[PDB]
UniProtKB/Swiss-Prot annotation, chain B:
GO terms for cellular component: carboxysome; cytoplasm. Homodimer (RbcX2). Interacts with the exposed C-terminal peptide of RbcL ('Glu-459-Asp-468'); binds 2 RbcL peptides per RbcX2, stapling them into an RbcL2 dimer. A slightly longer peptide binds with a higher affinity, but no long-term stable interaction with RbcL is detected. Contacts a second RbcL monomer via its peripheral polar surface. GO terms for biological process: carbon fixation; photosynthesis; ribulose bisphosphate carboxylase complex assembly. It is found in: Carboxysome; Cytoplasm. Keywords: Bacterial microcompartment, Carbon dioxide fixation, Carboxysome, Chaperone, Cytoplasm, Photosynthesis. It comes from Picosynechococcus sp. (strain ATCC 27264 / PCC 7002 / PR-6). The homodimer has 2 functional domains, a central cleft essential for production of soluble RbcL in which the RbcL peptide binds, and a polar surface which plays a role in correct RbcL subunit arrangement. This is RuBisCO chaperone RbcX. Changing Q28A: No longer assembles RbcL8, forms a larger misassembled complex, no active RuBisCO formed. An RbcL-specific chaperone. Required for assembly of the RbcL8 core, acting downstream of the major chaperonin (GroEL-GroES). Acts on newly folded RbcL, has a transient dynamic interaction with RbcL and is eventually displaced by RbcS. The central cleft of the RbcX homodimer (RbcX2) binds the C-terminus of an RbcL monomer, stabilizing the C-terminus and probably preventing its reassociation with chaperonin GroEL-ES. At the same time the peripheral region of RbcX2 binds a second RbcL monomer, bridging the RbcL homodimers in the correct orientation. Induction: Part of the rbcL-rbcX-rbcS operon. Changing E31A: No longer assembles RbcL8, no active RuBisCO formed. The lineage of its organism: Bacteria, Bacillati, Cyanobacteriota, Cyanophyceae, Oscillatoriophycideae. GO terms for molecular function: protein folding chaperone; protein homodimerization activity.
């Protein structure tokens, strides 16, 4: 329950980073298509799932954008983290409900 | 309130906890019933856990007992872990942010 929470937090760290790049990209696509297109070719070269390696690699190519990510991911984290436990737990119960109903019906079908 | 982003993160989290459930259950089975653990291995190559609903549903065709074990374990895990994540991820991002910032500004320093 602690190894699990560590692994989960790390995954969320990567995930929110990803989500930051996504948002920045929606904006670049409108604002600097050159850069937006650049970003795509970059994330193909580099696996966003590795948050830090992704950033460290990008430090070598577009320092301004790396800093913008760090800021945006943190904004997102503060906008979003707090509502997560309610939303996930409630979603799991609902999904657990549906899957149980489904398979208990399926057993007798 | 970033709604689209909370919705997509929650969903991701839902699946990730399912994954984490499958991971424990997999460890138990590897000791208890090796045959079944092998099965759960390649089942997982045939079906991506990131789409957890589709995964559990496809599993229903093959091992309804396990589907039920997954549902229970994942909910337990959720109860154990969710509470602690907002402080944990925020404090991690801040740290990581500081390190990246400090490392980038020192790269310019050279």
């Amino acid at each position: 329950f602690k190894k699990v929470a560590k692994e989960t937090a790390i995954t969320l760290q990567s995930y929110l980073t990803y989500q930051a790049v996504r948002l920045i990209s929606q904006q670049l696509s409108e604002t600097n298509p050159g850069q937006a297109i650049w970003l795509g070719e970059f994330s193909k070269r580099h696996p966003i799932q590795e948050s830090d390696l992704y950033l460290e690699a990008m430090m070598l190519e577009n320092k301004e954008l790396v800093l913008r990510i760090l800021t945006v991911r943190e904004n997102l984290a503060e906008g979003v983290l707090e509502f997560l436990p309610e939303m996930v737990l409630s979603q799991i119960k609902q999904s657990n409900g549906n899957h149980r109903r489904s398979l208990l019906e399926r057993l007798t079908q």
